[PDB]
Design a binder for this molecule. Structure first.
Ligand code: HEM
Ligand SMILES: Oc1ccc(Nc2n[nH]c(-c3ccc(O)cc3)c2-c2ccc(O)cc2)cc1
Length: 394
């Protein structure tokens, strides 16, 4: 005879392969081959995953080095692999972080109103409805337009870059460059547009004219807008879609949350823990020789941190495949990563999902799949696991 084990194992986002637990038990770090032909170390236990993510010698930025073993081809300029470091070095971290909290005045009510309106529209049109294309994704897209302070009507055209921008491809993608360059010009226009005074782009636009930021490049400011829109929308849309499947498949849970919506945040934390939204391990490149379990990882080697390996590890989360709302370590999952690169949009992602699920349970308490679960079409060669359509009735 056979060839080296290949990753990823399955694009299905509704079930974890039995193979993951067997791997975790027998070889929690082991060699695998990625879609580019490169070799990598696949890490699958909670203990080893957290070790890698907490040790900055396993570098995110160095993954972009010419000649490194790759998980997939870049769909961004190599400097953007260090996007958070670049934000931090420009003195913009605190401002970005403040602009993307779900606590801004009126933002939550906007999310509720938007979710309610999307659902009323589905209800009027009649079953079946597609909860990804006509609910989760538009909710994500509308949230991010509002966060960024850009017009709602520009959401759809930005969003349509993302089926390419988030590909997980063996080779470079011509369309990713075309879209990237166009979306950057869009966000450069936004920084020059006097009507844009709110949200992240309103704040960046002010900071750009402030003498404390006069040497920050226009490229960086536009990049922040493109990347935060893209990462946020893909991540929240994907998460919410596959969380809705997990909830639909658990009518006793669906009913407990409908009846006691105060438990929704605890439900969302468990939906997060069990989520299979990330299609690949998180990539890092070793910058030193580092012992990880039984393997001495060598400098210049690629390591992949399998989030579901950690999140279903029974030594950290007993009965890992069960959603239990009373765990003693409920936010200790790795759905938002860990360490230097911990998700800066985590609070926003939680609130998007909370409010989407709250609205859906209230408007469609009888929600159920309208097709057998095996009929869902899983997107392949992508950085997220998502069903192309999510047909439901109620
Ligand atoms: C449920 C929703 C989300 C999930 C499950 C998620 C998950 C993740 C994870 C696992 C990472 C770590 C990647 C790594 O360490 O290699 C990450 C990083 C990132 N997330 Fe999220 N995230 C979500 C929502 C968002 C939102 C709403 C935004 C922005 C508006 C966002 C922006 C980013 C950015 C910019 C990074 C890179 C951070 C860095 O390189 O230091 N995310 N996220
Ligand atoms: O080290 C990396 C670098 C990038 C990524 N993921 C991404 N793939 N695509 C993009 C991307 C986002 C928006 C857009 O209009 C076009 C592309 C990302 C990405 C994800 C997070 C970022 O901080 C920057 C880029 C994942 C790991």
């Amino acid at each position: 005879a056979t060839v080296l084990l290949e990753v990823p194992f399955s694009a299905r986002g509704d079930r974890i392969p039995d193979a993951v637990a067997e791997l975790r038990t027998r070889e929690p770090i082991r060699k695998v081959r990625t879609i580019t032909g490169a070799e990598a170390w696949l890490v699958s236990s909670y203990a080893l995953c957290t070790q890698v993510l907490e040790d900055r010698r396993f570098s995110m930025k160095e993954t972009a080095a010419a000649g490194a073993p790759r998980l997939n081809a870049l769909t961004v300029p190599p400097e953007v692999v260090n996007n958070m470091g670049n934000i931090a070095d420009a003195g913009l971290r605190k401002a970005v972080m403040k602009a993307i909290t779900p606590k801004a005045p009126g933002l939550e009510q906007f999310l509720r109103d938007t979710a309610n309106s999307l659902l009323d529209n589905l209800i009027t049109e009649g079953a079946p409805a597609d909860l990804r294309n006509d609910f989760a994704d538009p909710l994500a897209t509308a949230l991010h337009c509002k966060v960024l302070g850009i017009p709602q009507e520009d959401g759809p055209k930005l969003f349509r870059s993302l089926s390419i921008a988030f590909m997980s491809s063996a080779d470079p993608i011509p369309a990713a460059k075309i879209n990237w360059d166009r979306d950057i010009e869009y966000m450069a226009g936004i920084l020059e547009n006097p009507n844009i005074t709110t949200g992240l782009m309103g704040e960046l636009s002010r900071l750009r004219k402030d003498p404390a930021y006069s040497h920050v490049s226009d490229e960086l400011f536009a990049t922040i807008g493109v990347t935060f829109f893209g990462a946020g929308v893909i991540s929240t849309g994907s998460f919410l879609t596959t969380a809705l499947i997990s909830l639909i498949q658990r009518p006793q849970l669906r009913n407990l949350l409908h009846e006691k919506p105060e438990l929704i945040p605890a439900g969302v934390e468990e939906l997060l823990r069990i989520n299979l939204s990330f299609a690949d391990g998180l990539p890092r490149l070793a910058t030193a020789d580092i012992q990880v379990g039984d393997v001495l990882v060598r400098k210049g080697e690629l390591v992949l941190v399998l989030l579901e390996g950690a999140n279903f590890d029974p030594e950290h989360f007993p009965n890992p495949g069960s959603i239990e709302l009373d765990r003693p370590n409920p936010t200790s999952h790795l759905a938002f990563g860990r360490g230097q690169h911990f998700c800066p949009g985590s609070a926003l992602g939680r609130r998007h999902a909370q409010i989407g699920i709250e609205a859906l349970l209230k408007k469609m308490p009888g929600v159920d799949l309208a097709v057998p679960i095996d009929q869902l079409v899983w997107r392949t060669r992508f950085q997220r696991r998502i069903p192309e359509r999510l047909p439901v009735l109620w």
